[PDB]
C-alpha cells in the first residue's frame, strides 16, 4: 500500500511534478465469473507528460480476490504466456483485505523528448477470481502530471 513511482531515478530519491487535471471512469464489473487472465487494457490518453492513475475498487470484509494493476509502456499486444511476467512493469496489487486501492505514477517515456501515440497503457488483470461469503466495481482515476 502506498504510491509507486515506476522507473524512478535513484539519484532523485537520495536524501518536481504534480497532477494538473483529473478524471474518473468505471472499468469493469469485478465478478467471480472471470477467471485468471481477464485483461482490461486502457490506452493513455483515452505533450511530454507523466501519468498518475488511482485505480480503486469497492470491496467489503466479505469480498476476496486480487487485481494486478500495471502501466505497460507501448503495449502492442500480450502473448499467451506473457501475462505471468506482467510484474516486470510498474505495478501494484489490489486486495480486498490489504489495500483495496492502487496508485501508480510514471514519468514521460518515449524515443523522443516530445510525444504526439499511446505511450502508456493501463492494464488490469484478475490475478485470482473474486470470492465472497453485492457486486464489486472498479473505478480508475487518471490525472496527467507535469504536462
Amino acid at each position: 500500500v502506498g504510491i509507486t513511482y515506476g522507473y524512478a531515478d535513484a539519484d532523485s530519491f537520495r536524501p518536481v511534478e504534480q497532477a494538473e487535471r483529473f478524471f474518473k471512469e468505471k472499468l469493469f464489473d469485478w465478478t467471480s465469473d472471470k477467471p485468471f487472465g481477464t485483461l482490461y487494457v486502457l490506452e493513455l490518453p483515452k505533450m511530454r507528460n507523466g501519468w498518475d492513475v488511482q485505480v480503486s475498487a469497492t470491496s467489503t470484509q466479505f469480498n476476496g480476490g486480487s487485481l494486478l494493476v500495471a502501466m505497460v509502456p507501448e503495449l502492442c499486444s500480450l502473448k499467451d504466456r506473457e501475462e505471468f511476467q506482467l510484474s516486470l512493469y510498474p505495478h501494484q496489487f489490489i486486495n480486498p483485505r490489504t489495500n483495496t486501492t492502487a496508485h501508480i505514477q510514471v514519468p514521460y517515456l518515449g524515443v523522443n523528448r516530445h510525444d504526439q501515440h499511446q505511450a502508456w497503457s493501463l492494464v488490469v488483470m484478475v490475478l485470482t477470481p473474486l470470492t465472497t461469503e453485492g457486486t464489486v466495481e472498479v473505478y480508475a482515476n487518471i490525472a496527467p502530471t507535469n504536462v
Binding site: 509507486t4 522507473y7 524512478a8 532523485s12 516486470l88 505495478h91
Partner: protein, 44 residues
C-alpha cells in the same frame, strides 16, 4: 527505532506531494523494475 511499517526503510528522499519536513520517507523498492514506493514520512 525507525518509525516505518514492516519492510519499509528510511533514507529515501520524499518526492513532491507528501509534506514531510525532514524529507525522509519510508521508501521501499518494489512494484516493477526501478520502482520506488513511498508510504509516509520518517520520524527519528
Amino acid at each position: 527505532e525507525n518509525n516505518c511499517p514492516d519492510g519499509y526503510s528510511c533514507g529515501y528522499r520524499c518526492r513532491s506531494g507528501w509534506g514531510c519536513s525532514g524529507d525522509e520517507c519510508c521508501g521501499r523498492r518494489g512494484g516493477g523494475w526501478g520502482s520506488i514506493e513511498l508510504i509516509a514520512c520518517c520520524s527519528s
